[PDB]
């Protein structure tokens, strides 16, 4: 009844999925704190996504997730300094 | 001296090569992708300048985690533009 919709949801969230990979990737400690923080955002983005109606609300969902992936790791390296 | 000569060159790298580094996975009528990227190259020289006139090599760790903090928030704040509404 509600296909490409259902794909749509199931692409957003392997991708918030798939990003959160490639910003563990180049950083090298508090970094135990930046999984659990990451993983966190993950679960309630993808908790999300599958409550969303339009694709709009999707692709927000998953843009504003890899913003805030982002400025977790942010933190974290202003973070490492002294 | 040529052991601070080393950390510099070593930091520069850092910063150079984790500007690819940031850039992965960052995909999604028009973006301004552009100037994310100019702006993480200013970001890029900024620092590789920095490096250059640090003191010690515990100034330059600050500068170089600073420059991979401040690449990240770019990229956050791009990612938040990319939303609607």
Do not use: P, R, W
Not at 43 to 71: G, R
């Amino acid at each position: 009844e509600n296909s490409e919709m259902d794909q749509a949801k199931e692409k957003a969230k392997i991708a918030v999925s798939k990003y959160m990979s490639k910003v563990l990737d180049g950083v090298h400690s508090k970094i135990v704190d930046l999984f659990k923080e990451l993983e966190a955002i993950k679960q309630q983005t993808i908790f999300d996504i599958d409550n969303a109606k339009t694709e709009v609300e999707i692709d927000n969902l998953v843009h504003d997730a890899f913003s805030k992936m982002n400025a977790t790791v942010a933190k974290f390296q202003k973070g490492l300094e002294t």
